[PDB]
């Protein structure tokens, strides 16, 4: 599948991509999965992880 | 829903968060959706991208 950018992004990181609104991208399929935003209820930190490394409780 | 994490991760960015299998964690909602790994086809870049900012095409 290919994606298309429907607004412009200005990264923020050294692992994020920047992209302007009509770019053309594909999705890199990995060992990581997903990114998602998470708390952790055990240390109270808050940051994004990989999704393949948790699972439901 | 809470998830329980698998392994231990260690950040490498300042975003990331750190976690030791067996940590609850809960996940963020927001407006940057999951996020991908993702190749530009329109400049050669390589990186993570907010999936809520693109439609496939």
Same mark, same amino acid.
């Given at each position: 599948?290919?994606?298309?950018?429907?607004?412009?992004? &200005?990264?923020?990181?050294?692992?994020?991509? +920047?992209?302007?609104? %009509? @770019?053309?991208?594909? /999705?890199?399929? $990995?060992? &990581?999965?997903?990114?998602?935003?998470?708390? +952790?209820?055990?240390? %109270? @930190?808050?940051?994004? /992880?990989?999704? $393949?490394?948790?699972?439901?409780?």
């Amino acid at each position: 599948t290919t994606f298309v950018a429907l607004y412009d992004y &200005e990264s923020r990181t050294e692992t994020d991509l +920047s992209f302007k609104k %009509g @770019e053309r991208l594909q /999705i890199v399929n $990995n060992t &990581e999965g997903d990114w998602w935003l998470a708390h +952790s209820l055990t240390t %109270g @930190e808050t940051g994004y /992880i990989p999704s $393949n490394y948790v699972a439901p409780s």
